[PDB]
Design a protein around this ligand. Sequence first.
Ligand SMILES: O=[N+]([O-])c1ccc2c(ccn2-c2ccc(O[C@H]3O[C@H](CO)[C@@H](O)[C@H](O)[C@@H]3O)cc2)c1
Length: 158
Amino acid sequence: FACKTANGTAIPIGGGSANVYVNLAPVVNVGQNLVVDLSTQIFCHNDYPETITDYVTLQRGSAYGGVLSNFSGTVKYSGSSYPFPTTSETPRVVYNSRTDKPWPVALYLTPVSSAGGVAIKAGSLIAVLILRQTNNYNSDDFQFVWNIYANNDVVVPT
Ligand SMILES: O=[N+]([O-])c1ccc2c(ccn2-c2ccc(O[C@H]3O[C@H](CO)[C@@H](O)[C@H](O)[C@@H]3O)cc2)c1
């Protein structure tokens, strides 16, 4: 089991950490959601699906910078939503193919009532998402740590 990113970096067997750079909607209104879709950013596969089934969770999602200060919301993992920043580990998604498969995570972030002007700064860290991988074969339990950076400013109109 290993993963790769839309920025051309990787995390091999055994886990590790990578950076992800996301283009964000430039304007988000109070009462609306900023969508941060990681399924177009992070892709993983199973290295021996003939005999092994891989299990993958979002172990913890943490907010930083302008997301931490100016937004609330949810994380959608494989069709179900949970609070973000996270308060538990999600259920598992099965990886059962060598073919790249997106990691089905997206953040839905809404501005807090006090937000206005530049709410997320270009280049800044917005989230850290920990992917936990196990299997039905051995006792491997690996963390793939994804540091999510904004590529651009996000403005919340007054
Ligand atoms: O039954 N056999 O004959 C048999 C069984 C296993 C075999 C082979 C040949 C290679 N392997 C093998 C390949 C990869 C492997 O672990 C990595 O990939 C797993 C699947 O993605 C993942 O769960 C692990 O955490 C680790 O990332 C573990 C074993 C033959």
